[PDB]
Structures are given as C-alpha cells and as structure tokens.
C-alpha cells in the first residue's frame, strides 16, 4: 500500500463527513428552534437523532478539539458542573430539557450550539483528512467508548448513550470499508475478522433496540453488560489500530 492509493478513500471520507455536516446543520437547525420556541417535547424527541450526525464524525471531530467542547462538553468538564456559565452546548441543553423539563434560559445556548456547528463544518470543509488521523482517531474513538463512555457519562440526563454508541460504530465501520479494496488485496482474512467483529457489536446493541425499533435507556444495560459490550468494542479498536499498520501509515 502506497500513499497514493489512500488519496480515494479519504477523499470519499471527506465526502462521507460533509454530508454528515449537511445533515447536522439541519438537524440542528430543527432542534435548536425547537428548544428556542419552548417546545420541550420536540425538542426532547430530536436531541438523540440530531447528535448521530456528529457522533459519526468523532474520529476526526475530536481533531478540532475546540469546537468539540464547546459544542459537546459534558458538566465535569466545568468547574461548577451543571451550573457553570461556561457549560454550553448539546449536554448543557439536555440538562435542562431533561432533568428540569424546561427550555428556560437555554435560547442563548441553542444560539451558540448552531453557530459551533456552522463553524465546524466550516473548518472541516478547508480541512485536508491526514489518513493516520483518521484510521488512529477511529481506534481511540473505539477505545474511549468501552473505557470512558461505557458508564453512561456522555448522556447523564437523556440517557440516550445507546444512539451515540450506534453512531460511533458506523462512523468507524464506514472507514473499514472505505479501506476494505486496500486491505483485501493481501489480507482478505483480516478484513473478514474486522467485518464479523463490527458485526458482533452491532449484533449486542440490536439486543437493547425496543419492540418498536428504536433503543432502551443506557440504565438497562446491567454491568454485567456493558463489561462485554466494553471488551467487544475493545476489539474494535485493536483492529483499526492494527488496519493503521497495515495500510502503511505507521512510517
């Protein structure tokens, strides 16, 4: 695998986090009316479905770490937690929606939240995607999933972790097989072994999807499991790590 033959993939990668940049504006744009207005309710019913958007972009999203928290900070990353004048972004908002069931004193927030969300698609868009950023930046994302999200910190009020959790693993899939016509070449084997085990995640969140097709609460995973689901996803990132090497990156 040479550098040149990488110059595809990214390129359908930039492809890949643009449309997700489009969608999230959008969606964001949605919410954060919503929240403006005093819808409570819809505001509430959009918070998860907005959020996939920019959950499949983490392996990079993570690269601007300004924008990344002021728009998804969580309340220990403040001094004063959940009443902190500097707690803005998606987490602050559901805060109040969740825990207070209000959308008072959160409009200027929503304000700030769409514009970080106009700037970041504006940065990724001037942004050449290094491809050791990329396939590294999946790996950690996988890594901080089962060690650091897997006690349900990141959605402490919604308690929506599942959705992320999804969106994670189809933004990091969606880099595997954008690699996969690399890799198969002379190691179709390993390729089968990152696809059966992607899929074996997928296959452990179906189990807490609900009769009507959508996700449990995180409090219904026991520990139990969530210390599989953790060693699953720690497999997951072994192997975009090891797919780094593989695809030449590590020189």
């Known amino acids: ?91 602050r908002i559901e805060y109040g929606l969740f825990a207070q069931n209000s959308a008072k004193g959160l409009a200027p927030v929503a304000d700030k939240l769409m514009a970080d969300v106009l700037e970041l698609q504006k940065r990724i868009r001037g942004l ?53 016509p690399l890799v198969v070449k002379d190691n179709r084997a390993f390729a089968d072994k990152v696809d059966a085990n992607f899929d074996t995640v997928f296959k452990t969140l179906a189990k807490y999807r609900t009769a009507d097709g959508g996700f449990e609460l995180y409090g219904k995973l026991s520990e139990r499991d969530r210390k599989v689901l953790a060693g699953r996803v720690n497999t997951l990132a072994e192997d975009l790590s090891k797919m780094r090497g593989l695809l030449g990156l590590d020189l």
């Not at 005093?38 to 907005?50: H, I, M, P, Q, R």
């Not at 990141?154 to 972790?161: M, N, Q, V």
């Open 1 to 91: 695998v040479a550098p040149l033959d990488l110059v595809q993939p990214i390129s359908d990668y930039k492809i890949y986090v643009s449309e997700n940049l489009q969608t999230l504006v959008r969606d964001t744009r949605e919410f954060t009316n919503a929240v403006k207005a005093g819808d409570v309710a819809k505001a509430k019913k959009l918070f998860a479905s907005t959020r996939m958007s920019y959950e499949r972009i983490e392996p990079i999203a993570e690269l601007f770490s300004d924008l990344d928290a002021s728009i998804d900070s969580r309340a220990d990353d403040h001094e004063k937690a959940e009443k902190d004048p500097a707690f803005f972004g998606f987490h």
């Open 128 to 180: 050449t995607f290094p491809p050791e950023k990329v396939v590294g930046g999946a790996a950690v994302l996988m890594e901080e999933v089962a060690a650091t999200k897997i006690s349900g910190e990141e959605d402490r009020y919604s308690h929506t972790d599942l959705w992320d959790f999804q969106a994670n693993f189809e933004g990091a899939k969606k880099i595997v097989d954008l690699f996969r």
